Write a protein that binds this ligand. Structure first.
Ligand SMILES: N[C@@H](Cc1onc(O)c1Br)C(=O)O
Ligand SMILES: N[C@@H](Cc1onc(O)c1Br)C(=O)O
Lengths: 258, 258
């Protein structure tokens, strides 16, 4: 049967085409993950329907209700057959859903407005003049919340009680905050998005320092799903064929605006 | 039996005493509503236990699940017997819980950092240099979201799509945002809180213009609760005795710091 794909609106992975009001179904979307989905489907021999996750979240378990939300939840509760998006492979998630080998590598990074006197996480941790935060949900927020590393623990201690809140709901919001804060806000986000934004007008942001960690995005399926094996092989095959690199250049650098 | 009172941490209505770690039960709290609760209890002849609402919300119904949250939810689902807090009397709430006649009047107002070139809601609506927002929940946010009045509709249209978000989770956060935004953020909140903050150090904020609307706070009880009649009479009696005015001066002006 037709495979239900859950994804999320996150540039340049999945974006609404400017003329989406004129289009229907899968044709409404474009981006790295839209292209990858087509490639995976072709190599696994299935037809599919792209759907945007209802709550706009990646996936976390509520500590109280213990209910999974986001794309992970969609897979766990059987609402979708596969998730093709910038979904970070983490221990807690790996325990409830199946992940293909990573199709892209990344690490947490720092985004600053050009000219901000910050070069590293250590720099940020030792001052308060420049506020800094992360998305209000997701693996980056959790990285800091759970970290036992001195510098990161110090940063989380600051972030969790900073007022006003240093957390943002979407990447777009964090970028807007960096751009409109006159250098007084630094955004902690995954290197992939940071690198993409650095090449977008008004070209006033930049990624600074090295990544704080190293991980990857994986295609996810419900635990035990028979689709898992085929998808994993397709990811490895596409990587070996250079297709993944081609898609990266296509959506990040080929049409960079800076 | 002992009456379970649900309330919320909102200065100067209910605040944790600085040495609360040394205290137990009702003695941990102080404020206008803590004093009012004692007065109402005495005049209604009941003993009570103050409890802080679990989700820290005032009360709204989820459009999807249709479940009430906040203090209103606590009353609707029988978790508390009465709510004594700065709970705004609104049509939607009046339909699900009982409200005493108002114990305090108020209106939505504008808080600015001293020196901000804004004198009214109209001023705010006609510009974008100075961002402005409200709490991310509650009657003030709903006032703008539902308003059919031109100026307020224009303001909501701006607020709902402004990036980064102009909404804050708590009053403290909004105040912090006004104070740290160098005049680039104006906070829309109820006049009562605005007036209180204006008299608190560092004395860098002020209420400007008249109130946008007029309403009041009421003591709430589960719909049909027998406690409702007594509480309403106590509110009227306390007002006529001048007790409510005395409490207002006690928590707002007597010890003003500006
Ligand atoms: N990939 C993360 C989400 C995320 O975490 N930090 C960001 O900037 C973004 Br987008 C996840 O899967 O939770
Ligand atoms: N009193 C309101 C909450 C509220 O609405 N605007 C504020 O500043 C505050 Br506090 C309510 O009962 O929803």
């Amino acid at each position: 049967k037709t495979v239900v794909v859950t994804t999320i609106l996150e540039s340049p992975y999945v974006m609404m085409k400017k003329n989406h009001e004129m289009l229907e179904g899968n044709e409404r979307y474009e981006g790295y993950c839209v292209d990858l989905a087509a490639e995976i489907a072709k190599h696994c021999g299935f037809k599919y329907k792209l759907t945007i996750v209802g709550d706009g979240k990646y996936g976390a378990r509520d500590a109280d209700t213990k209910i999974w939300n986001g794309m992970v939840g969609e897979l766990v509760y059987g609402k979708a057959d596969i998730a093709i998006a910038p979904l970070t492979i983490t221990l807690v998630r790996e325990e409830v859903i199946d992940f293909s080998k990573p199709f892209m590598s990344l690490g947490i990074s720092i985004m600053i407005k050009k000219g901000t006197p910050i070069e590293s996480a250590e720099d940020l941790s030792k001052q308060t003049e420049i506020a800094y935060g992360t998305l209000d949900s997701g693996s980056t927020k959790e990285f800091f919340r759970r970290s036992k590393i001195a510098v990161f623990d110090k940063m989380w201690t600051y972030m969790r009680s900073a007022e006003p809140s240093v957390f943002v709901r979407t990447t777009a919001e964090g970028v807007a905050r960096v751009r409109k804060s006159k250098g007084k806000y630094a955004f902690l986000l995954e290197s992939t998005m940071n690198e993409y934004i650095e090449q977008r007008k008004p070209c006033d942001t930049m990624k600074v320092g090295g990544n704080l960690d190293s991980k990857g995005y994986g295609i996810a399926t419900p635990k035990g799903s028979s689709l898992g094996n085929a998808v994993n092989l397709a990811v490895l095959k596409l990587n070996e064929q250079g297709l993944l690199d081609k898609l990266k250049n296509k959506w990040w650098y080929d049409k960079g605006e800076c």
